[PDB]
Structure formats: structure tokens, C-alpha cells
Design a protein around this nucleic acid. Structure first.
Ligand SMILES: [Mg+2]
Ligand SMILES: [Mg+2]
Ligand SMILES: [Mg+2]
Ligand SMILES: [Mg+2]
Ligand SMILES: [Mg+2]
Ligand SMILES: [Mg+2]
Ligand SMILES: [Mg+2]
Ligand SMILES: [Mg+2]
Ligand SMILES: [Mg+2]
Ligand SMILES: [Mg+2]
Ligand SMILES: [Mg+2]
Ligand SMILES: [Mg+2]
Length: 70
RNA sequence: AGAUGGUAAGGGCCCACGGUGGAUGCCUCGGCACCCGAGCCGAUGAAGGACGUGGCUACCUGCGAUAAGCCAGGGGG
């Protein structure tokens, strides 16, 4: 995923409430599973999308953790 | 009547060239000694591990279900 898009994901991410974050993760986590399935049947040529989503879920959770910790 | 050479089944010594084998010289990502710097870690769960972790991954390295990585500051180009 693009550098600029990362920064953009973070800005909008840091504006969410934990619940919105929790909900957002669950969907991107669901999208990861959808990706894995098509990856299974050789129907995902844009395979970089898998690594990409994994780190989004990472970046979200990191921020979810940010929200809670002080 | 007498006498003396060509035979090499195979073998021996020398010479040429190969095979095998990995000495020798050169080489060094490693080691060895001395000197200096530096010296604790852990229930806020250590040292050391197990099992996992990649779109395709046997192993090593890294990492821990956020899993060859996540956030921020500094360095760099
Ligand atoms: Mg990043
Ligand atoms: Mg004769
Ligand atoms: Mg002969
Ligand atoms: Mg013969
Ligand atoms: Mg002889
Ligand atoms: Mg020879
Ligand atoms: Mg020499
Ligand atoms: Mg000393
Ligand atoms: Mg020490
Ligand atoms: Mg350990
Ligand atoms: Mg688990
Ligand atoms: Mg920087």
C-alpha cells in the first residue's frame, strides 16, 4: 500500500472511537479471510493485497491500543 | 655332422599421455593472544526454548495470531 495512503489511514483512524475501531478491524479481518480463500483457488493475482491488509489490521489495532493506554 | 637368429601366453625397466587421488603454493567470510573500553538480567515473567509466522517457503535469519512485522523520534538519500 502507498506511503501517502498509510498516513491518510492513520489520520482517519485516530479519529475513531474504540468501538468504531473494533468494528473496522472485524471487517478488514473478514476481508482478509475472503482474500485467503481466493488465494487458495489461485484466483488472487494481486497477492500483495494480503500483506497490505494484514498491516492495516495491525495499524488499526495499534491505534485501538493507543486509545486505551493512558 | 655343427652352429647361430625370428616366437611373448604373460612379465620386467625406461619414455609419452591419461585416470584416480587431493599433497604443495597462493588465498581467507574464521580463529588465537594481548591491550583498552564496557559489565548484570528477572514476577513489569529472565536466561533458554517449544509451536507457529511469507501469495508459492525444506532450512537459517527476523518476528509473535498486530507474527520477515505495528506506532513515534533521530540518522540517511
Ligand atoms: Mg508502515
Ligand atoms: Mg630361436
Ligand atoms: Mg613381450
Ligand atoms: Mg597379449
Ligand atoms: Mg625381470
Ligand atoms: Mg596425471
Ligand atoms: Mg604466503
Ligand atoms: Mg581489562
Ligand atoms: Mg554483558
Ligand atoms: Mg526468550
Ligand atoms: Mg491464538
Ligand atoms: Mg524518518
Amino acid at each position: 500500500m502507498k506511503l501517502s495512503e498509510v498516513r491518510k489511514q492513520l489520520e482517519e483512524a485516530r479519529k475513531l472511537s474504540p468501538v468504531e475501531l473494533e468494528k473496522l478491524v472485524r471487517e478488514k479481518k473478514r476481508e482478509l479471510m475472503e482474500l485467503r480463500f481466493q488465494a487458495s483457488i489461485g484466483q488472487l493475482s494481486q497477492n500483495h493485497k494480503i500483506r497490505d491488509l494484514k498491516r492495516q489490521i495491525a495499524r488499526l489495532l495499534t491505534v485501538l491500543n493507543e486509545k486505551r493506554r493512558q
